[PDB]
Amino acid sequence: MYVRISGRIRLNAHSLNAQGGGGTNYIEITKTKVTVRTENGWTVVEVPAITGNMLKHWHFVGFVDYFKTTPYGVNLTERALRYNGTRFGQGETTATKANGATVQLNDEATIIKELADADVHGFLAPKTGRRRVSLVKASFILPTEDFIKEVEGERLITAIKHNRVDVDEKGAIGSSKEGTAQMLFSREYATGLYGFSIVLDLGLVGIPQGLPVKFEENQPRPNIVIDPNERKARIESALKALIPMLSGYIGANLARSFPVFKVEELVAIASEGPIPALVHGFYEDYIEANRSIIKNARALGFNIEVFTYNVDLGEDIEATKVSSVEELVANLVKMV
């Protein structure tokens, strides 16, 4: 049961996914170069962005949060409870389960059976060679093209300075000789309307990627190493992980910035069989392309379901208007 989501969200006063600085008093927001058509010819512009890796990490965080409450929630890694995204670093051949049990890494079936994070978000153990591609595909968050057209850059960035006050028992700022830590650092904050796209190929949960089928009598059937209730719980948790992503829980510096994060518009499709990915929301002409893709794919015989928020998509396409992301995930979990 596959899902594709795309759309546009407006972010203000956000510093998500900065460059960290490391050992300096300046922290820069991550930059990436994008190609813009423009009426004067193709150009390249450096714009702030949020890497897809952190988007994937926050989806993993949401999935763990919603799977902990599930009665089958014991089937997680101890690292997952701490939101540690590392999957079986080099040199280790064992995994510590949430309950404390030890799981061998010599077989992929057991790993996906009693470790949900490795099942959904994939894993890799260099020591033994086992691997599994992730079931979640995340793309970069980029400011949309027509926004760059309309704003003409404006540098889209401010630098705000915060102090590091170290007042001792005597009430002095010090002179960096006694051991005080009174300094002045700075953080970069961006704004604008960004576009996002996310892909969930939730059709291999609990099914090893080595032997997806069994062929009992030359009749294909999914090879599930777990009971169907665990599959349903994992799929529901993965779908519900989108709620603490479109509310403003994406990115870093949440304690001091907490991006404003209004969702502007979105379109999503979901189907049991394989379907083409939707058009990313960065492009200005992405509603028409998505409309054409949906219409022609449904003409080809694909049984897809379309949910649209703040997008009309005309009349020919049979789509259900959705009020918010919560209603979208409710509809998604309605159809198992």
């Binding site: 008093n25 300046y26 512009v45 850059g153 404006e154 540098r155 960035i157 630098a159 700075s186």
Partner: protein
């Protein structure tokens, strides 16, 4: 033209140590001057910090900074006026943006 070095010497004060005014954003914006409008705007933001450095240099026993003369501003205005080609504009901006980082001996 001789004023590029004059304005780069002033721009060096926004990044150099012993000044505690770490204005990397304005230097990067000047270096990333896509059009003449935002190049002039970035130069204005860089120039607005003149009183702060001017007072702090004498507040910490350093020679006063060499704020660019009005002749340099006139030359910059002329160059911005007569350069409507981004090809030359990019290298013009980079020319005075590069001088910010160097081994300047501001405080002996």
């Amino acid at each position: 033209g001789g004023w590029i070095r004059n304005i780069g010497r002033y721009l060096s004060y926004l990044v150099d140590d012993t000044f505690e005014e770490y204005a990397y954003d304005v230097v990067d914006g000047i270096a990333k001057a896509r059009t003449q409008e935002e190049l002039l705007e970035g130069v204005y933001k860089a120039l607005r910090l003149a009183p702060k450095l001017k007072k702090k240099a004498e507040s910490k026993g350093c020679p006063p900074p060499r704020i660019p003369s009005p002749e340099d501003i006139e030359a910059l205005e002329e160059k911005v006026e007569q350069l409507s080609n981004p090809k030359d504009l990019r290298k013009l901006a980079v020319s005075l943006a590069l001088w910010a980082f160097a081994s300047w001996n501001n405080c002996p």
